[PDB]
Amino acid sequence: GSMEQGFLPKGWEVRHAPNGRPFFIDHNTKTTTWEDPRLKIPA
């Protein structure tokens, strides 16, 4: 369904770095940071 279509807020995307850690990028304002929106955003 649409669960795999939206893990993060609209515009946000998770990417894995060589070290194996996931960083999150906001395509909206082009903001990239190390956080876990899933632990804060109750979607």
Curated annotation (Swiss-Prot):
Q: Where in or outside the cell?
A: Cytoplasm; Nucleus; Cell membrane
Record annotation: effect of changing W34A: Abolishes interaction with ARRDC3
Give residue ranges for domain WW.
Answer: 6-39
Assembly and interactions?
Binds, in vitro, through the WW2 and WW3 domains, to neural isoforms of ENAH that contain the PPSY motif. Interacts with BEAN1, LITAF, RNF11, WBP1, WBP2, PMEPAI and PRRG2. Interacts with NDFIP1 and NDFIP2; this interaction activates the E3 ubiquitin-protein ligase and may induce its recruitment to exosomes. Interacts with UBE2D2. Interaction with PTEN is questionable according to PubMed:18562292. Interacts (via C2 domain) with GRB10 (via SH2 domain). Interacts with ERBB4. (Microbial infection) Interacts with viral proteins that contain a late-budding motif P-P-P-Y. This interaction is essential for viral particle budding of many retroviruses, like HTLV-1 Gag and MLV Gag. Interacts with Herpes simplex virus 2 (HHV-2) protein UL56; this interaction induces NEDD4 degradation. Interacts with Ebola virus protein VP40.
Per the record, the domain comment is: WW domains are involved in recognizing PPxY motifs in substrate proteins. The WW domains mediate interaction with LITAF, RNF11, WBP1, WBP2, PMEPAI, NDFIP1 and PRRG2.
Q: What does this protein do?
A: E3 ubiquitin-protein ligase which accepts ubiquitin from an E2 ubiquitin-conjugating enzyme in the form of a thioester and then directly transfers the ubiquitin to targeted substrates. Specifically ubiquitinates 'Lys-63' in target proteins. Involved in the pathway leading to the degradation of VEGFR-2/KDFR, independently of its ubiquitin-ligase activity. Monoubiquitinates IGF1R at multiple sites, thus leading to receptor internalization and degradation in lysosomes. Ubiquitinates FGFR1, leading to receptor internalization and degradation in lysosomes. Promotes ubiquitination of RAPGEF2. (Microbial infection) Involved in the ubiquitination of Ebola virus protein VP40 which plays a role in viral budding.
**What else does UniProt say about it?**
A cysteine residue is required for ubiquitin-thioester formation.
Task: Give the protein's recorded name.
Answer: E3 ubiquitin-protein ligase NEDD4
This chain's source organism reads Homo sapiens (Human)
Q: What lineage is on file?
A: Eukaryota, Metazoa, Chordata, Craniata, Vertebrata
Q: Which residues of the full protein are shown?
A: 838 to 877 of 1319
